[PDB]
Amino acid sequence: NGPEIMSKLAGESESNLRKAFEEAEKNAPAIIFIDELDAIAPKREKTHGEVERRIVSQLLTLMDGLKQRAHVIVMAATNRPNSIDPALRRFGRFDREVDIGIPDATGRLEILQIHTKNMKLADDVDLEQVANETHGHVGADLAALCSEAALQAIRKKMDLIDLEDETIDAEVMNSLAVTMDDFRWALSQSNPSALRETVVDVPQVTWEDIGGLEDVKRELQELVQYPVEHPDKFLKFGMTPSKGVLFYGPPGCGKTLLAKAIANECQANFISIKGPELLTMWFGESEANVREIFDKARQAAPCVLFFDELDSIAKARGGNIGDGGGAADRVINQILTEMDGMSTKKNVFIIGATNRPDIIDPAILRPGRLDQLIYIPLPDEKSRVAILKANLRKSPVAKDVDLEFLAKMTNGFSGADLTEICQRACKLAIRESIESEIVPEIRRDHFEEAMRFARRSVSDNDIRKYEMFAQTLQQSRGF
Amino acid sequence: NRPNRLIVDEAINEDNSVVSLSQPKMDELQLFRGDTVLLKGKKRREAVCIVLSDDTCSDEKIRMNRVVRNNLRVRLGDVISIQPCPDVKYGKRIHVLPIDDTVEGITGNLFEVYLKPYFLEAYRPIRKGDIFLVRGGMRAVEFKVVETDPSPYCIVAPDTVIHCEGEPIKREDEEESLNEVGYDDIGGCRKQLAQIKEMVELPLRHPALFKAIGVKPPRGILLYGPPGTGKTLIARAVANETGAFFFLINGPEIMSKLAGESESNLRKAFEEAEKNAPAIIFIDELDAIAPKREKTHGEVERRIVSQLLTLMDGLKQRAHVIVMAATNRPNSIDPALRRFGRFDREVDIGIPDATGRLEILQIHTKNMKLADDVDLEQVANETHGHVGADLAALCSEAALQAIRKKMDLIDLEDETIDAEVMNSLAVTMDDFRWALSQSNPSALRETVVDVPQVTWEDIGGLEDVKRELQELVQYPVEHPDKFLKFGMTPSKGVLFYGPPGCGKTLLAKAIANECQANFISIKGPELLTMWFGESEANVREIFDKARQAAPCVLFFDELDSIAKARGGNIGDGGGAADRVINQILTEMDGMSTKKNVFIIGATNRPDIIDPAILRPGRLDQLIYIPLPDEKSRVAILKANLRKSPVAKDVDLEFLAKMTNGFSGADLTEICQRACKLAIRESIESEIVPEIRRDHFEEAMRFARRSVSDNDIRKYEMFAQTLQQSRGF
Ligand SMILES: Nc1ncnc2c1ncn2[C@@H]1O[C@H](COP(=O)(O)OP(=O)(O)OP(O)(O)=S)[C@@H](O)[C@H]1O
Ligand SMILES: Nc1ncnc2c1ncn2[C@@H]1O[C@H](COP(=O)(O)OP(=O)(O)OP(O)(O)=S)[C@@H](O)[C@H]1O
Ligand SMILES: Nc1ncnc2c1ncn2[C@@H]1O[C@H](COP(=O)(O)OP(=O)(O)OP(O)(O)=S)[C@@H](O)[C@H]1O
Ligand SMILES: [Mg+2]
Ligand SMILES: [Mg+2]
Ligand SMILES: [Mg+2]
């Protein structure tokens, strides 16, 4: 144990390490597990006492003194891998690194089953729903949630259980069952530890969540699925696949949904890094964080690395023209460096999205970094019908609602505008239900009233400017 | 089975021994309001008391006072055996004796000050060996009957004679000192006390059951909050209200020891706790011994932190040991301590609100005698940044001020004054006003998480935005079933934009008030100064604090100041997005949807607000607050003139039609100027107390318009085209 070793007196912890290694070498094949390795071996550049440096040097010597004949395997665990002294992570000391990441929905469902297999669950307990409703939770968080649910179940059974009795018998303990309400209460007051952690997972949104955009769907399929599914054709014809795609167009037209859906179809890991996130994570002058992003994407291959809201990055210094200076600062140079320095044979795909193509820096568009320029326009008449149908899948829409009428009544609306219209109509239906309580079907009148106050989020001049950039954006770089 | 067992928990009646039951219970046990009941406890002892009729207490619970809780030797959560006693009782002789642990320093005839105005008009029953508490004379003493007629056969009657002995008896170890801190000594923290009880008392009170079940007990409770909020008081109370051995570890006291001797003290404390039954280890000022190991100098301190981590990790479920810690700087604690298995439960003891601080004032003045003009509610309202320690200091200062005016009536030559004059000294409301006049609130800089007082009645007009805010906030928190039926996820953000002084802040505060939800106001200048220290964790702490207060509304006022830090969207060419705004967007995107936190932004510069704020999922409900029209101006004037004695001849609609481009702030300025003219008239006439029509005419003569016509046109332009914004 890290803290247990560090708690000893100076010159006594080294004896403990030597004794542990001697015992491991003596006693057959053995495993040495050093829990919380960062406790005893932090970076020697950032440490105060010489006793700590003696400890680190002793650990290095013991690791280097390991022979193949010893049949001794040393395992270590640390929640701060970057705080570990770099000398430990070299060859011969700690070469294999295993990342125990945050569990996904299926994994956390499995954890919930493992932790509730001892408990008795009521018939209304839906562990799948609980797993879906827990996002930032880890195994410890789920264990705490299960324990809290069991305690809540007990707290309502204090009368059926004779608290005067010293040791209750099992004929009543099994009668106490944990209801889904208890799990809901436990989930209501729970603090997920891994909320801030970046998510590496396959997104749930599929092509059915996207209306229209069939051509870009086909293009994304050809760009992503084919190199990962049929490498033989690519090596036969001799072309190296392009590793980057840039999405540009008016806001709210589905740039994020397209990246998530293409990640879903390939069943590849998806990492979303937003522009504001980069701007705050670099403000601490931490150049290793954006490098860690690319490293994390590398181990998740096949993976798609999606940089959303590049306009926020490009608006940090004004833009390409702006007042005269360039928008390239901070992360973007390191992002370009990482894109140029990533292995081609790796299955990592990089997708960028921005609704400000005017101010995107030219170096992003250079071939070899992001040379597949895909323009997502505003939906046309049929795409608007498709978008409305996709957004109204989960709502009980009445039969008399004419979706194509709404599509032809909206011309310059984007996908976000149509979603806003649907949400406003649903909110009017909710208000109607609330008023009638003091019917549960959204009607034609609700859509008419919502369309009365519907607003257009893209100007005609903006449409013209986007059309201009849709044709001439490859040029950009050069002047 | 046995419909006579009652669950024991603390009462709410601030009086002597009076038990309170639920509505079905007095009918089920055939006892009326003014009836005599008998309480039977453990160790073959009884108690007699008078029931109270209560309805909104619980389904099945008795209410047990702390005065006679020790009389039955029963603690919180215990089971008691009740019995109605329809036996007529009357006292003839009751030999009563105080205890010489709390009556020291009191002389004279203690009956006429303590017992005489406590017995009559009460008719309370007294049992053999009863320890009842009497407050008075700016101190509290408990009292003990030792000899009377056979038990109990005694009630308080005017026909009961008494005689003093002058030799109080000593206190044995069979009973617990009532002078010690209990649950009733803490005010303003009932939710936190409820959480602490739920997390602590069940494992401690039933260690065998918790060992039999084999489930994880929370053993890492960490109290935190501003200094003087009662963390130590809460820990000591929880220790006293449960039969758990309590071992106290002081941060500075441990750190003051020599190197290699503090570790011995920590090990000894943990060994004692493990050995002695269920136990509580309280480490007051945890940051003293365990700061961040990244920021620390000596290796002895790191040894201390590592030893603490090892001791915390060496805790087993069979040990039945709960470790509690208190720190006023939770962020200075080493992060390794706050992980799973060491300190997982965190309880925030925040600044008390007006009701909480009123409760604290009552708790601290219950010993003192207050004059009839003392309005503790007014004192609580007038104290904003005060904490429990601040209020205790205020009460002590008021008592000292009262004494300072009584130095002549009290013989300062006499060694020990008698209580017949001490009770005559009463603390006046003037003394409290003087104490409040010179007092330094410690928690002035702390952010306030409270339900605001301003309601819709403080806002004139704006009916449509009131309805829209109700639909946006109340409905998702009141009827989630409709939302999940229709499949729409509620929007979590609203942006207010419009001309200045039209009620953007009042709307957010009022919608917080109506929902009875916590309200956090963060102003733009506050963000700009709090980020200037390069503290990225502070705006994260704001969102974290809003998360625990759910349902809560997080209001960012004066976003123009944030947007004007770098000029604006166009400006000289650069963007206004800097510093906080990127982290604010990150926090908005990274907050849980099922949480009931609602985010409201306000700005009077919609031109320079950065587009990323308006993206769907962050702040997509764009609500425009215009200048008040004719009827809204009447409503605004009426709302502003609620507290003033406006004369009957004042025509408010005339003023409304005489003001066209005025905002709410302009009308408030007009009302204030008219009131100031009335004040000047009163002052001049002193060398009438009704603001008149002439005052309003004179104020309107100098009334000024704070929004230009060009500004009105520009706001109307942005009122129609602001969703566009983002994109070019
Ligand atoms: N093709 C589409 N089909 C269905 N919904 C869409 C479509 N395009 C946009 N939306 C809606 O618009 C929302 C925003 O989608 P995004 O992919 O984030 O759009 P965007 O192009 O990235 O622009 P922003 O800045 O993110 S709003 C989605 O959550 C949908 O509700
Ligand atoms: N909520 C409260 N109710 C009643 N009295 C209180 C309350 N908070 C504080 N007090 C009084 O103020 C005194 C000081 O409180 P303490 O608990 O000692 O301070 P603290 O909470 O430990 O914070 P520290 O020690 O300065 S970090 C207590 O002894 C009480 O007399
Ligand atoms: N609808 C209203 N009814 C009554 N008083 C109002 C109203 N609108 C504004 N006021 C007055 O104007 C003051 C300022 O209110 P705020 O809500 O802060 O206005 P604002 O829109 O936030 O603009 P500023 O920058 O804060 S003055 C209030 O304290 C009231 O005195
Ligand atoms: Mg997006
Ligand atoms: Mg303390
Ligand atoms: Mg304001």
Residue numbers in the entry:
A (entry chain D): 270 to 707, 728 to 768
B (entry chain C): 21 to 707, 728 to 768
Paper text:
The human AAA+ ATPase p97, also known as valosin-containing protein, a potential target for cancer therapeutics, plays a vital role in the clearing of misfolded proteins. p97 dysfunction is also known to play a crucial role in several neurodegenerative disorders, such as MultiSystem Proteinopathy 1 (MSP-1) and Familial Amyotrophic Lateral Sclerosis (ALS). pmcp97 is a member of the classic clade of AAA+ ATPases and is an essential cellular enzyme. p97 is composed of six protomers forming a homo-hexamer with an N-terminal domain (NTD) and two tandem ATPase domains D1 and D2 (1). p97 is an essential protein in regulating cellular homeostasis from membrane fusion, Endoplasmic Reticulum-Associated Degradation, Mitochondrial-Associated Degradation (MAD), Chromatin-Associated Degradation to NF-κB activation (2). Critical functions for p97 include the translocation and restructuring of proteins from large cellular structures such as organelle membranes and extraction of ubiquitinated client proteins to facilitate their degradation through the ubiquitin-proteasome system. Here, we present cryo-EM structural analyses of four disease mutants p97R155H, p97R191Q, p97A232E, p97D592N, as well as p97E470D, implicated in resistance to the drug CB-5083, a potent p97 inhibitor.
However, when bound to ATPγS, in contrast to displaying the dramatic quaternary structural changes observed in p97WT, the predominant conformation displayed in these two mutants is one in which the N-terminal domain is in the “down” position in a state most closely resembling conformation II of p97WT. These results imply that the mutations decouple ATPγS binding in the D1 domain from inducing the structural rearrangement of N domain from the “down” to “up” conformation. Although we would expect the E470D mutation to have minimal effects because of the conservative substitution, residue 470 is located at a critical juncture between the D1 and D2 domains. Our studies of p97E470D suggest that this residue is extremely important in maintaining the network of interactions by which the structural changes in the D2 domain are communicated to the D1 domain. This could be achieved by destabilizing the D1–D2 linker downstream, leading to inadequate transmission of D2 motion to L464, thereby blocking the critical inter-protomer communication with the adjacent 355–360 residues. Analysis of the p97E470D mutant structure bound to either ATPγS or CB-5083 (data not shown) in the D2 domain appears to show no significant change in the local binding pocket of either nucleotide or drug relative to WT structures, suggesting that the resistance exhibited by this mutant may not be directly related to the changes in binding affinities. Instead p97E470D may exert its effects via changes in the ATPγS-bound conformation by decoupling the D2 domain from the D1 domain, suggesting a second possible mechanism for p97 dysfunction.
